[PDB]
Design a protein around this ligand. Structure first.
Ligand SMILES: NC(=O)c1ccc[n+]([C@@H]2O[C@H](COP(=O)([O-])OP(=O)(O)OC[C@H]3O[C@@H](n4cnc5c(N)ncnc54)[C@H](O)[C@@H]3O)[C@@H](O)[C@H]2O)c1
Ligand SMILES: NC(=O)c1ccc[n+]([C@@H]2O[C@H](COP(=O)([O-])OP(=O)(O)OC[C@H]3O[C@@H](n4cnc5c(N)ncnc54)[C@H](O)[C@@H]3O)[C@@H](O)[C@H]2O)c1
Ligand SMILES: NC(=O)c1ccc[n+]([C@@H]2O[C@H](COP(=O)([O-])OP(=O)(O)OC[C@H]3O[C@@H](n4cnc5c(N)ncnc54)[C@H](O)[C@@H]3O)[C@@H](O)[C@H]2O)c1
Ligand SMILES: NC(=O)c1ccc[n+]([C@@H]2O[C@H](COP(=O)([O-])OP(=O)(O)OC[C@H]3O[C@@H](n4cnc5c(N)ncnc54)[C@H](O)[C@@H]3O)[C@@H](O)[C@H]2O)c1
Ligand SMILES: [Cl-]
Ligand SMILES: [Cl-]
Ligand SMILES: [Cl-]
Ligand SMILES: [Cl-]
Lengths: 325, 333, 334, 334
């Protein structure tokens, strides 16, 4: 029995994915918007396509595949009439703010974002075992961490990482402006028209990797380039390894760790081929480069992800695992 | 002493208005007001994704931007009552926020000490609406708050004026094919005003939306009152737009007669085009409307004629230039 | 005995045509022809920027693709009369290259031994032109080359049929607001066919361009012969379109009457929509045309009425489904 | 006492912008252009440009010529350079901008037609010297007939890579150019002429991985970096304007400030220095071949080991064009 705070991109897609899930179901959503607008945006999606199911608005609820889900329009989480709250508003990104859902009535909580260093942070398929169930607020990290972590863990376990720099070439998101206009958080680059620009912007995914993979703590950093695609992204990591490697060995080790969370690709795919996938990360063997200069090696590895759907499915896999405890 | 202008809302229209007034003689911007620190505003003034780098010097100071050496005071007060327009000797306020679009709200600037307001949007019917080059003569000087109409109205009005004078208009339906604007969302998300179509990702969609522009032609040209209506389709270009009018005229016409009549009426406000241009060629033009003779169609069936005429506009720069022309005329009179 | 189809031009329409024919019974694609090695065609069949991954299996063999376990021979002959259509027993060619869009050019396939050709485009004024759901009865099977018209005609025709049948049309002007297509350049560059507007960067511009969909409507709906014309505005969406028709009707009308008549005429080819949808909601629909009742306008000024009706279409998938409906109907008589 | 008379082969993105730039130059003038198209189309694309704006000058048509700022420029449409009247017109240098003659034997056709020298607007193979103006133009000794102005990415990377090599020493480095899409990509998903499965995909819809030899070419432009760099490209949906990231291991310790101060110290007309929070569209139309962005400099130190990222912007159109013109003027002066 799950509940979704923030019926945004992540919140609405989560409901779509939970609709296919057993033993947990979305019982209620909360947003800042009337139900008619939430229902419309659930049914019709510019990048994820039409919802595959029935969705109609009843009195104070929406009916998805025959079942009723209550809808609320409150900007105060403490005043929510609440087992697990998917926190997807983007405004309660730490334990103190997310503790307000617990004092609204609900037991546990999964923050759909980095939740700080005082909350356990799980990338499903990498370190979900660190959870023992007694946690009240957990974090599923960022979209980029879920892409970076499986690739980086394999590099750490199989060769060891001295250090690495990341570049995520990222779809634009709603925290960028449609056209040039003042930006709420003072970011001079996110203020620019999103669909017209390559936009450099900072990201902490690589620096914070130690929360998911302790043995990479302090070894990675990087930054982002936002580009005019509405969803679909990739993460490059340029690293110095501790032992020699070939492109073939690197790719072979990637394939060995492939799972429902970590896909392995050998086709000449582009970003739109990645829209809607359910892997949290899709390794691209075609982009692996090991460059050797006088015995010294420098390595580039690349993984794709749908920053929307890839993260949503990871959010649901982690949500399911956390519930089984 | 120059006419002293203050800009309320340093947005798309506000910033370009500053650019155009910088090149004008006899008038200068003394202050701008917005919701933002001066550093964010200065950056957006220098760098523009569709209109190019600012061609001039622009520097940051303590609560001010210095444009071509001149200090422009920067305020960040969302209540226009409290702005020091009186203290600064402001003559005219360009009201460009999108939030003070009627007579009583815009009169807060006059209570703050300014003499006149021009609203950069439709301002209600108890405020005169001026499309420069069509009906500015309706001003008699005693007005305090006026409107420069919408971007689309400034595009349609000169085209409709020629059709009415030369042939007479029975009725007409407009379709504006419009660049997306800041009132549309970057990605699918809740929309503040409840618009299920403006809620959708702007650069991904053909987005139908309503507009009162064709109805308001009935105000700029009274002999067209109740005769026009239309709608909009927002499309994924960041600026640059066109207006189509399908009309029933009262007298027979040919494609050549319509085009010749458009050219004869061309001016600094109403341009005349015969090239095979597309919307990006229209970015940054200074005509309020650019008639496209290549798209004129007069279709005759059993004596009955149905006419399509098309004009381009940069919904940003074209409108800004009409806004500045009206401002200069209004400040003189 | 299944109806054997070949696809000439494995492009946007050609590849989607294979997807739809794969789901059909009694008809199957035996071969495709393009100017390209099979790996490139297999790759593009599998991966599609606007229509999504192929929902099925697709693998490469020697100069052939295997779709859902079935071999489809692949050819690369740019001259269609040298294709082995007769030898393979090909009943119908879907002509989707954009280079053989009249009777003389498309007859190459009959010279190569195929029995019938359907052109996925306007085929000129001297070939039967069919919008499925409007006029497929004009076919008796003895035709050798027919046209399924353009994407816009399949959008315009069902809407215009209702207006003509229910109210009578004096005249009308169309505007299609259309996704950019492959006949426009990626960036500003010389254009092969000399069009100064299609030369411009497709995804940066509103691009006026001509279209014969309304002017040629008389081939599909005889009572509208010579009564419509119109034009296009190409805009930066990669697929998905709408058609506006501004018309003068012969008798008075209300928006509700127009909308009710559209819904009454709705079918698998002609959808009826009442939601506040935008173009991306229309990518991948199977209606040839989706009428939008929210955009209907009847304007009355001193008794005189001017009418606007608007219909959506996925110029890719909407047209493809119309092409396959026409193909199936044509093959059941051939 | 005669101005340098230039012919432009390929009136494309680079060809047309080169004409704009040469019009502003003293001592050099365009005498003719050649393409595959009638003069009306070339004139139209010269006046109107979706990313670089309207031409700021006069441009009119005549009988098989364009008149730019009052001066006549002859227009030809012959696709074999052997037959061009380069000798008869006294053409000193040909800017080879077609993308179809990017090696020495193909480009020497302009010499056989009567021209004295050729500059290829692209990598030209290894038996043609590759010149990035401001980095290595002194390698020309005058005896060259055919030279290359390299690629846009090589012109972006080279001044940045030169400062790091001279000031700190470079062990190795990997490049990623995040690059505007170009005309070698398809408008929508379609077969690709050269068999590239990613450039086959819709350009304005995708992040498109693609290979580039730019980082390897630095080993030719800056011989002390031979064999030390490689990299690749991601084409993204902006119509022009790009950046190049370099992740490198240096030979001596460095800080962000030292790296930036050295970049600023080397700035010139070719190599710009930026400290503002700019995005790609701010770079459209710049005349630097490379614009270093001090705001993206990163030095990461982990247990004494350092890894360095430096980033430079470029307008792959105008930045390269101005580099092309500088190289032309220098090459023409010998
Ligand atoms: N968008 C992505 O690609 C992405 C990827 C990974 C992680 N995330 C994270 O997920 C979170 C949500 O981002 P998003 O993409 O859904 O953006 P969004 O703008 O689509 O989602 C926010 C939604 O919640 C609503 N909302 C805002 N404040 C609220 C409040 N106080 N109470 C209730 N509803 C409120 C908004 O109206 C909107 O519908 C953020 O923390 C973001 O960093 C997003
Ligand atoms: N953009 C166009 O094409 C266009 C064309 C014609 C007319 N207009 C009209 O011009 C007006 C402005 O449009 P825009 O496109 O420039 O919008 P915008 O969002 O780009 O700019 C509006 C600015 O006003 C500021 N603002 C908002 N509320 C404020 C307040 N209370 N006090 C001070 N500053 C405040 C915002 O911070 C923002 O910078 C609107 O009324 C719009 O309808 C726009
Ligand atoms: N794209 C649409 O929205 C749309 C809609 C309706 C109708 N149509 C029509 O369908 C046709 C194809 O359009 P498209 O968009 O699919 O084009 P496309 O460019 O995507 O596909 C054309 C294909 O034909 C191939 N081809 C070209 N010349 C050939 C030859 N001589 N022999 C064999 N193959 C050849 C090309 O290599 C390419 O794969 C055109 O007539 C077009 O007007 C297209
Ligand atoms: N676009 C960039 O950012 C960029 C940057 C640096 C270098 N370059 C290089 O410059 C060259 C041109 O690139 P572009 O982007 O201008 O391409 P383009 O497609 O815009 O221009 C090529 C032009 O050459 C013409 N042409 C082709 N074959 C011809 C022939 N046989 N004879 C005469 N004219 C012919 C074409 O009609 C076209 O106008 C390529 O080698 C490219 O790699 C491009
Ligand atoms: Cl970095
Ligand atoms: Cl309407
Ligand atoms: Cl028309
Ligand atoms: Cl690489």
């Amino acid at each position: 029995k799950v509940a979704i705070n923030g019926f945004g991109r992540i919140g609405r897609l989560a409901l779509r994915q939970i609709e296919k899930a057993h033993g947990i179901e979305v019982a209620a959503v909360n947003d800042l918007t009337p139900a008619e607008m939430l229902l419309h945006l659930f049914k019709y999606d510019s990048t994820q396509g039409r919802f595959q199911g029935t969705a109609e608005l009843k009195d104070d609820a929406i009916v998805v595949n025959g079942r009723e889900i209550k809808v609320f329009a409150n900007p105060n989480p403490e005043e929510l009439p609440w087992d697990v709250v998917l926190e997807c508003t983007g405004f309660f990104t730490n334990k103190t703010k997310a503790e307000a859902h617990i004092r609204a009535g609900a037991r546990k909580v999964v923050i759909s974002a980095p939740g700080g260093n005082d909350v356990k942070t799980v990338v499903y398929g990498v370190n979900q075992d660190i959870l023992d169930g007694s946690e009240t607020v957990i974090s599923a990290a960022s979209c980029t961490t879920n892409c970076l972590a499986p690739m980086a863990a394999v590099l750490q376990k199989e060769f060891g990482v001295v250090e690495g720099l990341m570049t995520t070439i990222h779809a634009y998101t709603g925290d960028q402006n449609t056209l040039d206009a003042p930006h709420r958080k003072g970011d001079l680059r996110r203020a620019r028209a999103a669909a017209l620009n390559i936009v450099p912007n900072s990201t902490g995914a690589a620096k914070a990797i130690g929360l998911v993979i302790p043995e990479l703590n302090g070894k990675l950093d990087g930054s982002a380039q936002r580009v005019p695609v509405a969803t679909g992204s990739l993460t490059e990591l340029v690293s110095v390894l501790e032992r020699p490697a070939t492109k073939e060995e690197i790719n072979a080790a990637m394939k060995a760790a492939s799972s429902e969370s970590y896909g392995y690709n050998e086709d000449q795919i582009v970003s739109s081929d990645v829209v809607g996938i359910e892997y949290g990360s899709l390794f691209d063997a075609t982009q692996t480069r090991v460059m050797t200069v006088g015995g010294k090696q420098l390595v580039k590895t690349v993984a794709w992800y749908d920053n929307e759907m890839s993260y949503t499915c990871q959010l649901v896999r982690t949500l399911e695992y956390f519930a089984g405890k």
